[PDB]
């Protein structure tokens, strides 16, 4: 899914099997699963990393299957969900680090293009999240404000 700026037909990904009900081999209930989610967010892990750890260590496939809820739903219930969304945050951190690189390296135009594409993605997601309310309407990407944000 290099699509969107590279147009390679990559198919790497997950293959969730159709599951109307949770697996019987699973030990944990919805409640303790939620507790683990909250524990790991306090340990400082993003939701993606939380699902990864619960898949690899605790053998939990699809917190959604188990609890009926999503990880970010659990986080916002326990008052721990991130202020701005994670994917946007990640892009912004990338862009800031790259801004720094490019100030010390002005002739790296290929990395400059990578920055341009990164900020394009940012703008797209900002548009969508303004439209859906996950950001204020007046929110807008800016490099310096984003630097303060990350920091």
């Amino acid at each position: 899914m290099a699509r969107m700026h590279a147009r390679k037909r990559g198919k790497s990904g997950s293959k969730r099997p159709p599951r109307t009900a949770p697996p019987t081999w699973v030990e944990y209930t919805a409640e303790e699963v939620e507790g683990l989610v909250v524990k790991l967010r306090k340990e400082g892990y993003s939701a993606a990393m939380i699902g990864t750890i619960l898949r690899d260590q605790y053998g939990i496939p699809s917190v959604k299957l188990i609890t009926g809820k999503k990880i970010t739903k659990i986080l916002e219930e326990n008052g721990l969900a991130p202020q701005i969304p994670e994917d946007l945050m990640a892009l912004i951190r990338k862009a800031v680090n790259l801004r720094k690189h490019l100030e010390m390296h002005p002739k790296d135009r290929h990395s400059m293009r990578g920055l341009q594409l990164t900020e394009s993605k940012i703008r797209r997601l900002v548009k969508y999240y303004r439209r859906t309310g996950k950001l204020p309407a007046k929110w807008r990407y800016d490099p310096e404000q984003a630097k303060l944000l990350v920091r």
Partner: protein, 63 residues
Amino acid sequence: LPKNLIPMPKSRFLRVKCIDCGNEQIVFSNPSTTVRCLVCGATLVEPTGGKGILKAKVLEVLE
């Protein structure tokens, strides 16, 4: 009908026990993180590009 209808995982969840504590623990065969025993801190599977390399499963199951 075969191999693209209902694309199904090749990975498996599998039950292992550590050599040190002996606690049975479910894990994933294709981990992105080094999996540690919940009791001892022992690595049960070390991550790779694909199927993780398994330590400490001498009594094993797979679901």
